[PDB]
């Protein structure tokens, strides 16, 4: 109350506080030295620590942003002269996503652990300026755990290799997901998120009353709202409080929550987040009897629209674990929109009930078909298919972007396509919702396609629908073949396959940018000839060298195949 920095210092603790501040500066500035950030992060916590004792020390009276902003502005800047709650908005809009940035280690673990774990937070945070900081702290203590497990062992890279990567992937995905959440919260607004979380947790927690879930969602909303606005201390704190509340009344929400609440701190906050769904109790009326069969649905709808629709979202969501969170939201939107029409008459909205079936069917078909295809070519070929696809869809977009997001798109198949069929559609699009966001978040700063920004700006829920039905773009004026995109290097055959695939794919994107209306076979030819070219020349020893025949044999064969 009387001192907020002291409040958060008291509630969170010095270490988590310090870490969180370090993250804050890392995310906000991104561009500065590590030590320079540990300096500030060190000095702020001392002020906090002093004011945890003496709450009436000067400047401890202030709000967190008031201090934080001025203390930012001390760092050697048009953003700093707003000196209003707009400080942040400037500081927040100026956050660079896609910013660049590319026993010896363990020796430093024992020497200066806190520093070692600090730099992790720094590195991760500056890459991902919208990271769920608490989660990042969890990942930090995991990072602590790794070397403890492996650094005091005979073989290092064996037990260190896979676990670092395994952690890393889970860092990446986390970043992406939090970015989606905050994207909804900032670009689209409260209710979108406050609709999303309902369906999500309604799936997750059936038995739960709509009221209980409503509270949980309100709280979660608060947490992420402040968390992704730069209010990281409050986010962490309220997250902890939320987990407390969740674990307390578990018997009122879910049976499976017992496992998590025995953790120490951040751990239950993670378990809970990654706990699965309790058994649906049914029971369960028709769902027709009320929101369809009833003559009073509209009388009840008009009294409280958002409650009614929220209740419909709850009721429908819990009964269908197999539906994607996006789908259910589209169904809720359809229901609402029809209720806005049918209403101001139980004879019309007796037909809304199956207007869903198409909306349910299109995704299902999409997922099954793309999975069918996935089983055919595997991840790589799936990525290439999606690559060609999205190059056709949005050929004005940056190549490296079009590569990245297509790989991310294809990886979905590896995540959630070998699952039980019943589980395929739910996952596939939940992540698609995450991957797609990044296509646009990357597209916002540098926009070049009306259809992409439109698609991603119109509706939070109808993003995939717009992205899959997006036809081939004929407005696009294809550029002539530049010989330099097809200039190559000996290294090509020295490279690791993993980073070789990118080299193969970038060219394919660049290939379609020249002829977007190309055919399956037509591309297959050049994909064969490219192979032919690299294998003859790279095996050609004294090469290359041989690559000096780059054009006259390959491109001078490729452009013909593409007529």
Q: Which of 136, 152, 179 is at the close of a domain?
A: 179
CA distances from 29 to 120, 123, 128, 232, 438 (A): 16, 12, 11, 15, 21
Is the CB of residue 363 less than 8 Å from the CB of residue 324?
yes
Number of separate domains in the chain: 6
Helix (H) or strand (E) holding 237: helix 232-248
- Within this chain, do residues 19 and 74 fall inside the same structural domain, yes or no? yes
ω into residue 283 within 30 of 0, thus cis? yes
18 within a domain of the structure (yes/no): yes
**Counts of helices then strands in the chain (DSSP H, E):** 25, 0
Cβ neighbours of 54 (radius 10 Å):
11
**Whole-angstrom distance, CA of residue 124 vs CA of residue 563:** 47
**Gap between the Cα atoms of 346 and 293, Å rounded:** 8
Pair (366, 460) in one structural domain: yes
Enter the tokens of residue 311. 């209740």
Three-state SS at 408? helix
CA–CA distances in Å: residue 296 to residues 41, 290, 343: 58, 8, 10
Domain boundary among 473, 497, 523: 473
- Tell whether 3 and 89 lie within a shared domain: yes
**Do 271 and 287 fall within a single domain?**
no
Of 497, 415, 20, the residue nearest 238 (C-alpha): 20
User: What CA–CA distance (Å, rounded) separates 510 from 476?
Assistant: 14
The method of structure determination was X-ray
Q: Flag whether 556 is in a domain.
A: no
Query: Distance (Å, rounded) from C-alpha 245 to C-alpha 266?
Result: 14
Domain presence at residue 382: yes
Instruction: State the number of CA atoms in the 13 A half-sphere of 149 facing the CB.
Output: 14
On whether both 487 and 468 belong to a single domain, the answer is: no
DSSP at 259: T
Give yes or no: residues 336 and 262 share one domain. Answer: no
Question: Are 124 and 52 part of one and the same domain?
Answer: no
Residue 557 inside a domain? The answer is no
Domain membership of residue 60 (yes or no) is yes
Sign of CA dihedral 48, 54, 57, 61: positive
Q: Which CATH number characterizes residue 509's domain? A: 1.10.246.10
Q: Which domain holds residue 53?
A: 1-96
CA-only gyration radius of the chain, Å: 27
With respect to residue 299, please indicate whether it lies within any of the assigned structural domains.
Answer: yes
Q: How far is CA 288 from CA 202, 281, 451, in A?
A: 19, 18, 38
Residue 366 shares a structural domain with residue 351: no
Give strand ranges (E) for 266-347.
none
Angstrom distance (rounded) from CA 321 to CA 76: 52
Task: Determine the Cα–Cα distance for residues 339 and 352; give it in Å rounded to an integer.
Answer: 9
φ, ψ dihedrals at 277, nearest 5°:
-90, 135
Same domain? 165 vs 209: no
Residue 316 belongs to a domain? yes
Contacts 24+ apart (CB under 8 A), 440-443: 441/97, 441/179, 441/183, 442/97, 442/98, 442/398, 442/401, 442/404, 442/405, 443/397, 443/401
Q: What is the resolution of this structure in A?
A: 3.2
Q: Residue 370 has which token pair?
A: 């793309």
Identify whether 528 is preceded by a cis peptide bond (ω within 30 of 0): no
**Shared-domain flag, residues 468 and 392:** yes
Residue 221 lies in a domain: yes
> Tokens 């120490």 label which residue?
264
Distance in angstroms (rounded) separating the CA atoms of residues 399 and 95:
22
Q: How many CB atoms lie within 10 A of CB 208?
A: 21
In this structure, are 89 and 101 located in the same domain? no
Q: Judge whether 315 and 287 are in contact, CB under 8 Å.
A: yes
Phi, psi dihedrals of residue 150, rounded to the nearest 5°:
-105, -25
For 58, residues 6+ apart whose C-beta sits below 8 A from its C-beta are none
Rounded Cα–Cα distance for residues 363 and 381 (Å): 21
Residue 16 token pair = 């988590």
Tokens of 85: 């709650």
Alpha carbon of 111 to those of 105, 121, 161: distances in Å? 10, 18, 22
Residues 469 and 376 in one domain: yes
Q: Which of 137, 157, 179 is the last residue of a domain?
A: 179
């Amino acid at each position: 109350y009387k001192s907020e920095i002291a409040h958060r210092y008291n509630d969170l603790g010095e270490e988590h506080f310090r870490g969180l501040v370090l993250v804050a500066f890392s995310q906000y500035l991104q561009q500065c030295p590590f030590e320079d950030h540990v300096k500030l992060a060190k000095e702020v916590t001392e002020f906090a620590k002093a004011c945890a004792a003496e709450e009436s020390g000067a400047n401890c009276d202030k709000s967190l942003h008031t201090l934080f902003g001025d203390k930012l502005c001390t760092v050697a800047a048009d953003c700093c002269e707003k000196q209003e709650p707009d400080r942040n908005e400037c500081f927040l809009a100026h956050k660079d996503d896609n910013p660049g940035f590319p026993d010896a280690l363990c020796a430093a673990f024992q020497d200066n652990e806190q520093l070692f774990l600090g730099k992790y937070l720094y590195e991760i945070a500056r890459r991902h300026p919208y990271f769920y900081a608490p989660e990042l702290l969890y990942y930090a203590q995991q990072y602590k755990g790794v070397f403890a497990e492996c650094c005091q062992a005979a073989d290092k890279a064996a037990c260190l290799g896979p676990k670092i990567e395994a952690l890393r992937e889970k860092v990446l995905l986390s970043s992406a997901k939090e970015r989606f959440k905050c994207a909804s919260l900032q670009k689209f607004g409260d209710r979108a998120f406050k609709a999303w979380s309902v369906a999500r947790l309604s799936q997750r927690f059936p038995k739960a009353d709509f009221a209980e879930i409503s509270k949980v969602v309100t709280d979660l909303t608060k947490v992420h709202k402040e968390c992704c606005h730069g209010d990281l201390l409050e986010c962490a704190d309220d997250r902890a409080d939320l987990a407390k509340y969740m674990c307390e009344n578990q018997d009122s929400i879910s049976t499976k929550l017992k496992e998590c609440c025995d953790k120490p701190v951040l751990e239950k906050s993670q378990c809970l987040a990654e706990v699965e769904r309790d058994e649906l109790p049914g029971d369960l009326p028709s769902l027709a009897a009320d929101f369809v069969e009833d003559k009073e649905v509209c009388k009840n709808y008009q009294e409280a629209k958002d409650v009614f629709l929220g209740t419909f979202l709850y009721e429908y969501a819990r009964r269908h674990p197999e539906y994607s969170v996006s789908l259910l939201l589209r169904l809720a939107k359809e229901y609402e929109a029809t209720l806005e029409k049918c209403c101001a008459p139980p004879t019309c909205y007796a037909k809304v009930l199956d207007e869903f079936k198409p909306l349910v069917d299109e995704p299902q078909n999409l997922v099954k078909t793309n999975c069918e295809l996935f089983e055919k070519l595997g991840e790589y070929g799936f990525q290439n298919a999606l690559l060609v696809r999205y190059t056709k869809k949005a050929p004005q977009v940056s190549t490296p972007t079009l590569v990245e997001v297509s790989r991310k798109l294809g990886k979905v198949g590896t995540k959630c396509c070998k699952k039980p069929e019943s589980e395929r559609m739910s996952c596939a699009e939940d992540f698609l919702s995450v991957v797609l966001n990044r296509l646009c978040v990357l597209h916002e700063k540098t926009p070049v396609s009306e259809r992409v920004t439109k698609c991603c700006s119109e509706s939070l829920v109808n993003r995939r629908p717009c992205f899959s039905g997006l036809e081939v773009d004929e407005t696009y004026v294809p550029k002539e073949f530049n010989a330099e995109t097809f200039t190559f290097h000996a290294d090509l055959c020295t490279l690791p396959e993993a980073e070789k695939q990118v080299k193969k794919q970038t060219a394919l994107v660049e290939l379609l940018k020249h002829k977007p209306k190309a055919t399956d076979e037509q591309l297959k030819t050049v994909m064969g000839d490219f192979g032919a070219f690299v294998e003859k020349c790279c095996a050609a020893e004294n090469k290359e060298g041989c690559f000096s025949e780059e054009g006259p044999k390959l491109v001078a064969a490729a452009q013909a195949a593409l007529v």
